[PDB]
Structure 1
Amino acid sequence: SGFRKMAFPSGKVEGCMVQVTCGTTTLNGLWLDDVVYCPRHVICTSEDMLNPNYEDLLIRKSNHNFLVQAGNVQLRVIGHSMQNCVLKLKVDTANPKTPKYKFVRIQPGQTFSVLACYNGSPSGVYQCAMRPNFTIKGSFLNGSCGSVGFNIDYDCVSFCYMHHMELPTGVHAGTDLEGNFYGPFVDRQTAQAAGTDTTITVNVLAWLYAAVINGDRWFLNRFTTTLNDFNLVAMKYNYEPLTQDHVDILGPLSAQTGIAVLDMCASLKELLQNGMNGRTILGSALLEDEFTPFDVVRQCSGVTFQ
């Protein structure tokens, strides 16, 4: 028993992290086979970053301008190209530690692990969710760009995020590994802002089921509700709508606990309308929305990875 915000083991990704330096700028790259991926703003300098034209900036660059550090071994760059907001640096050595991998793009509401890195060296690992407004609430300092987010499925790493920037409210924005930004953000230094966020309703319900599985039951009740009547309550409290597909996804957790999904919705309603009255749920005094139904089943059942 117990419930923690759990990341995937990071070993498979650690073996892919490299340092990329161009001019004044040092950031992280992801080395898979004979390509290093990194944010294209590495080719920028502090006055380039106000409003750059990256095609113009990149044609002015040479292979030898890119210094790639694989620990204490330098990688020879033999080609470079730009793919949307990422650079692909072709090197003359394939990474012998390349895991099986996929480039996937995730949906708002889904979770992933982040391996935060500085100078190509991993610093720590933590779990994030993609917010509905396409930001992530991360922990990133100067030099963390190019750190990646990922999930692991048995032995395959699905890379879903590469870090590019911090917005003025302290939240973070970045791209998938094809270089396409999540959300309406651009890799320029102009006034950008996150935009209004909402709470991920289906994840809150999943976490309430995790609490029941772990013996926290005080928030349960005999009442029930309809999906439509629940969603009127969700709208007022800035929760996003619950769909029938969400109800279906919660089915396993419903069946394991014997608590009908719509019954747990009735409990959430009372929690939204009444607060928590000085009590806690799974060690939290807030309704937590960064665990997916998959996360709960994985943790409350013991799935591993090889």
Structure 2
Amino acid sequence: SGFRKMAFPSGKVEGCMVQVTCGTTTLNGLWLDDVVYCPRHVICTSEDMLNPNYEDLLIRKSNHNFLVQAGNVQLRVIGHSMQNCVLKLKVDTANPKTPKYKFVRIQPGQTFSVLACYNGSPSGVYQCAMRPNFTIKGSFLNGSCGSVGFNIDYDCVSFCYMHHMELPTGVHAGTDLEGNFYGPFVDRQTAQAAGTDTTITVNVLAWLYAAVINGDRWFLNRFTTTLNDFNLVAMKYNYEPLTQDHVDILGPLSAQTGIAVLDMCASLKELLQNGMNGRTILGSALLEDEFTPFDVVRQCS
């Protein structure tokens, strides 16, 4: 019993974090086999952060301009290349700790663990979600760039996020491990702002099901709703639309608990109109939306 913001065990990623220095900038890199991955803005300089020309900056760099440190062992760069906004540094030594891994690009709504790192060294691990506005609400300080996000379903590490910058609202932006940004963000210091965020409705519903599975009943009601009327209610609370895919996805949790999805939808409607009234659900006083249907089953079954 119980329900926690549960991360994956970070050991497999810890063995991959190294320290990357170019010029005056030191940030984190990800060492897999004989490649170190890191944000390409490490080759940027204090004078040209607004409109760097990355192809021009990289060709001027020699392999020796990159200091890569795995613990206290210096790793020697023997080549480099750029893939979108990720820098790939070829090193002379393969990482003996490389886990079984893949690179995956996730969709808004997906969740992942983050190994927050500084100077190639791990600080802590938390759960996070791809927000609908394609930011992530992380915990990152200066020097965290290069920190990665990942899942470890079934002994295989799925890398899905590399941290590149903090936006003016205090939330965070980054790329998949192929260098493509999540959202309309760019690795420059030009004025760019997160769109209005919204609540991940299918995740809220997944979480209310987990609440039922753990013995909470008090938010339930005798009403049901249509998909269309619930979506009309959703949009008025900045909630993501609920689709038929989402309803299908909630099928198993519906069958475990005996509550039809649209019945749970009527509950969510009521909670939005009324609030908690001094109460909690699974120890929170807000509707949680960073637990997916897959997370609930993972941690309840």
What secondary structure, in the 3-state scheme, does the structure 2 residue paired with 1:230 have?
Answer: helix
Per-residue CA distance 1:86-136 (angstroms, 9 max, x = gap): 100000001011111111000000000000000000100000000000000
Q: CA deviation at 1:197?
A: 1.1
TM-score (norm 2): 0.99
Separation in 2 of the partners of 1:188 and 1:266? 44
Separation in 1 of the partners of 2:255 and 2:189? 50
Per-residue CA distance 1:25-44 (angstroms, 9 max, x = gap): 00000000000000000011
Separation in 1 of the partners of 2:241 and 2:192? 27
Per-residue CA distance 1:218-267 (angstroms, 9 max, x = gap): 00011111111111111111111111111111111111111111110000
1:260 paired residue number: 260
Separation in 2 of the partners of 1:259 and 1:284? 22
Per-residue CA distance 1:66-94 (angstroms, 9 max, x = gap): 00001010101000111110100000001
Gap regions ≥5 residues in structure 1:
302-306
Q: CA deviation at 1:51?
A: 1.5
What secondary structure, in the 3-state scheme, does the structure 2 residue paired with 1:116 have?
Answer: strand
Separation in 2 of the partners of 1:231 and 1:183? 24
Separation in 1 of the partners of 2:219 and 2:207? 12
Separation in 2 of the partners of 1:244 and 1:195? 25
Gap regions ≥5 residues in structure 2:
none
TM-score (norm 1): 0.97
Q: CA deviation at 1:178?
A: 0.4
Q: CA deviation at 1:274?
A: 1.4
What secondary structure, in the 3-state scheme, does the structure 1 residue paired with 2:152 have?
Answer: strand
What secondary structure, in the 3-state scheme, does the structure 2 residue paired with 1:204 have?
Answer: helix
Q: CA deviation at 1:216?
A: 1.2
Kindly report structure 1 stretches of 4+ aligned residues shifted beyond 6 Å: none
| 2:18 is aligned with 1:14 | no
1:87 paired residue number: 87
Separation in 1 of the partners of 2:228 and 2:22? 55
Separation in 1 of the partners of 2:45 and 2:240? 41
Separation in 1 of the partners of 2:158 and 2:124? 19
Q: CA deviation at 1:173?
A: 0.0
Deviating more after overlay: 223-232 vs 178-187: 223-232
Per-residue CA distance 1:143-165 (angstroms, 9 max, x = gap): 10000000112111010000000
Separation in 2 of the partners of 1:153 and 1:111? 12
Separation in 2 of the partners of 1:138 and 1:126? 8
Separation in 1 of the partners of 2:255 and 2:85? 44
What secondary structure, in the 3-state scheme, does the structure 2 residue paired with 1:228 have?
Answer: helix
Separation in 1 of the partners of 2:276 and 2:139? 28
What secondary structure, in the 3-state scheme, does the structure 2 residue paired with 1:154 have?
Answer: helix
Separation in 1 of the partners of 2:116 and 2:70? 16
Separation in 1 of the partners of 2:82 and 2:245? 38
1:191 paired residue number: 191
Cα RMSD (Å): 0.7
What secondary structure, in the 3-state scheme, does the structure 1 residue paired with 2:149 have?
Answer: strand
Task: Give the fraction of aligned pairs with identical amino acids, expressed as a percent.
Answer: 100
Separation in 2 of the partners of 1:75 and 1:107? 34
Q: CA deviation at 1:50?
A: 2.0
The 5 Å alignment of 1:218-257 reads 218-257=218-257
Q: CA deviation at 1:45?
A: 1.4
What secondary structure, in the 3-state scheme, does the structure 2 residue paired with 1:212 have?
Answer: helix
Separation in 2 of the partners of 1:48 and 1:72? 31
Deviating more after overlay: 172-181 vs 150-159: 150-159
The 5 Å alignment of 1:274-289 reads 274-289=274-289
What secondary structure, in the 3-state scheme, does the structure 2 residue paired with 1:68 have?
Answer: strand
Separation in 2 of the partners of 1:198 and 1:233? 14
Separation in 2 of the partners of 1:224 and 1:57? 59
Deviating more after overlay: 163-172 vs 234-243: 234-243
